[model samples]
Target chain A: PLREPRGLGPLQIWQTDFTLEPRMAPRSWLAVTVDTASSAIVVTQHGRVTSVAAQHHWATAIAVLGRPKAIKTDNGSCFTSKSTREWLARWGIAHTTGIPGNSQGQAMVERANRLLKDKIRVLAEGDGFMKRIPTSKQGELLAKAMYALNHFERGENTKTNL
Target chain B: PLREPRGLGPLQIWQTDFTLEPRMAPRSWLAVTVDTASSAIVVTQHGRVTSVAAQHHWATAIAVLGRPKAIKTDNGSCFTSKSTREWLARWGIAHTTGIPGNSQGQAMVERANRLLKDKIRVLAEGDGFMKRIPTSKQGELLAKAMYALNHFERGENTKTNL
Candidate 1:
């Protein structure tokens, strides 16, 4: 994975990662893809971060947002799976892998994952709650959080500010 | 299907239908879902309007937007399949079917389908063109059109007006 991937233009290089739910206990993971140029994001919640689930996420991204020139990911089994690599090759997408155990090599997706988790946590808490957001409600809240993250402007008025 | 669906609130009722390509000869269908209250729309293009594609469309919709209290569709074979009905039932979405040959019974999705195809055609033409947009470019354009329909406010300045 290239640290300063650039000049390929918008939606050309997408960095992918899986982040744990911020305020909830482990039951699912949020598969995240961030555009290298614009920080535009596509995210989905899956029961497990399997190769199939990862492919689903990317398929939706490509079908909805346009295919990227390449996608960058960590050296995870899901990314390296035969089916996934075959699928990527079929789509003519180059797959770049970060060195195992090194997040720095994939900074864009790592940064995106951090900010995404923080936002999801803040939104889930909803002005302060000690309790975890239940799994039943997490999907709904995840949708809201993703919408806000992708659409809201920098100074939009929001919340009770509690 | 009700002639005028209301009172349940946003996303309470979604009307879905598959529209054929506006200009292209023959290859794919666009699965469209329209919110009853807000007219908010979610659309996807598929190789065929099979039950599995229908389910995939709704799955993404529910995952990204909130789930609806009910879904409305025509009695098309693609929708009446056992798997699709069972999946909707599992999600606790009531399924309402229009009279087999009557479009009026599902007016929201019908009207949405018309407007969406018109927009896609205009977008695909890119000012003026006699050539059909290749299948390769259709997904990218579909993404652009869906994003605009869902996000753009009315009376936005536009185009050479060609």
Candidate 2:
């Protein structure tokens, strides 16, 4: 069963998840932070998906966006780390995990993972795209695509509130 | 003197700063986290600026974006608290503050403060805009504006790499 959000406001609730980059060596990943209220997204590219690297992305979002009253993430070591818990406690932020063995609980960020990857593919894999751009450049391109997704109109309408 | 950035890469360097909102009751303020490499911003806001509220923004950014190799901020108590410094040291994230009393030393985040406020004003204030929207709704509107700024073209644009 899908979980319903109580209410939506900036920093009131945030959702996070990670997805592997397409064919990147050493299994590069993109960790994403999404606001449940506004659908704003912050994407961070990582060389690996360890707790250390995961903290990098989460920290980036928190540093910019402010602390969510609470955050929901999957049952992963990265989100459940001792360091991460300590970090959350330091700010009085609450944390919850998705149901064990269930992906449906954190669907918003999961959808973002798919949407971001599709946008990245279009932006970075075209015939004329530069081939030798370094990983850092790939990250910039990914971030730019996120910027587009954040502003793009959703559903059937062409008009965007943005 | 202007401080030169050492290098540019996603999460390698992040910047932070605060700005007050215009004519809002209770004196609202915004705290921003910016990636020096990509000019990407994550914004956190509060009712009143305090070290506690400031930590909420900074921690939120760090939690989601991952640890920056280094962070730059001004010498405000909010950014320079013993707790904040200890947290940074624990994570091994390097920290730097602007030259005392010199705004030029942290111009990137200062610029972001201006850009974000402009976008927020344009999106939320107008003849037809709802004046009765609660603060939460106002925040949602502001987040949308940030979304647009994050994606908008910068500089002499050909095709974007994004």
Candidate 3:
């Protein structure tokens, strides 16, 4: 059994997770990858919970952040499938799955997920117009959310959108 | 700058800052170290805002987390003094100071600061007794707060304390 992760440096360990939120309207899946050492969210995607889509999200993140030494994910079909396993092997990245009874094993990435969800919610209802960008625009919203949360400060805890 | 930090991996760049809140009675300074890449806070201390105290704080973190490759701080006396520079030199760690006009350089750490402060506030007034932990017990409060925020999830945005 792979133990809970403890990162000693950047890119040493990453945790990826899915956030299925009904409030996301037309689309409701957010795939996020968080670097455990820095708690920096390397990248995010809004797509299906399939191995193909999972690969696409990790590909997007790896393009900018390079390959993390290893990644930790849940025992989902997306992460545990034959294709996903081979993909990790091709990239020379190790894979770690959560222990059966330990939700805390994925705490770092889950916190990142929670913060991103908060951002996505407000951005969905932001402004006087209550601008709604669903269907094809959820990714853009996520892009905006990550940019705001990762780039600068907000009020008492984090900045408010609207 | 050195320019804005982009961490390639863990321990490559760390940003330390002091949070002085009037809200924190008995002691008001929080010395925090955040890894730029992971956004993981390696260690924290509640102490005076001086070079010697800063060293003590880092020593506490280092004893547990080992030495980081480099550290980034503001132009504050605690970080810029002769003693501070020599200490880093002795440890074989590089040092960087933020640019005059670039707050983005230290955004990662400042965001970390915001989270810690939020935790401190809630813990200070938490429970039916408003069970405060000030004076000799402030560190316990911070330790409690960080454990809750950085370790697990809360419903809605994050878990709340009663």
Candidate 4:
């Protein structure tokens, strides 16, 4: 129903998106911003992960590492929201969008999401966990996911120069 | 590795083992304790979970119902420690251990550990999680495992009782 693509430029250039029917908490989505350089995940949350959430994350990243040269994202409403654009313009940060279906530019995020979902589906099936979990429970699951992902080590796939 | 086994009668025993690891924030080896009776669990600070952990749990079980006549556990130093014996004697609780080759008494815990490890392995592979997680993280994983086991139904095996 929607098309979005995010660019990966070393670290700082981040990507995010929403997943449909991912779980019971309907409209539940994840916002994950990774460091392209080290595959270091900068931020992730399980919620609307929309423009509002992204704006908050963007602001956080800026506060932590100063302003990034550019932020490349897909054509999601959150990315293109008036609020997001206004914030970006106010900060004088360049906003780049990937051409539709341009996998090369968005490979990092694609890879990240694929890996994340693979993990989710498997855990869900193993525990016979249904998608329609309560939001409070969803927070517990999200916390579990964050703990697991943050502590996990990456192999050659994550080791990179640029 | 010391071994101490105590039984609280059928489906009412609480056995435990403590593994100490270096920690900074808490500065102690993380000790894990499980109540055999229903697989209920109670964990305190690393040091608090000695035979004291078992003793404390037994007190809880007694407070809820009545005193379990026996206790079964591994022969961990904590179980065999002088402090543990003194406590057990004081509480008038009888304790036993699994016969080296005879695992009937220890079946629940041994099987529990295997099942837990298997689940963890699958989750790690499916989620690309790291193998060696810290103690606190291990607690989170174990908690998830407990939730999954308690909530998910399983097909009865040959040993299934009427």
Model 3 alpha-carbon drift over 4 Å, by segment? A1-11, A98-103, A128-132, A153-162, B1-162
lDDT of 4 by residue, A94-113 (tens): 56564211123456666666
Best by lDDT: 1
Better of 1 and 4 by lDDT: 1
Model 1 Cα displacement at B5 (Å)? 13
Q: Model 1 residue A30 lDDT?
A: 85
What root-mean-square deviation over C-alphas does model 1 reach?
20.0
> DockQ for each of the predicted structures, in order?
0.01, 0.01, 0.03, 0.01
Q: Who is ahead in lDDT, 2 or 4?
A: 2
What is residue A147's positional error in candidate 4, in angstroms?
3.6
Model 2: which docking level applies? incorrect
lDDT score, candidate 1, position B59:
93
Better of 2 and 3 by DockQ: 3
Instruction: Quote the RMSD, in angstroms, for model 3.
Output: 12.8
The TM-scores of all predictions, comma-separated, are 0.42, 0.42, 0.44, 0.38
Error of 2 at B117 (Å): 50
TM-score of chain B only, all predictions?
Answer: 0.79, 0.76, 0.76, 0.53
Q: What is the C-alpha RMSD of each candidate to the true structure, in Å?
A: 20.0, 19.8, 12.8, 25.8
Order of quality (lDDT): 1, 3, 2, 4
lDDT of 1 by residue, A29-130 (tens): 889988754567888877787999899999988875687656767778999888888888788776666321111366667777887888877787774555
Tens digit of lDDT per residue, candidate 2, span B1-162?
Answer: 111122111224577888887523343677888776567788876787777776678678877666665667767887678777666666666666532111235667777888887777777665245343355466677678778778776655576565
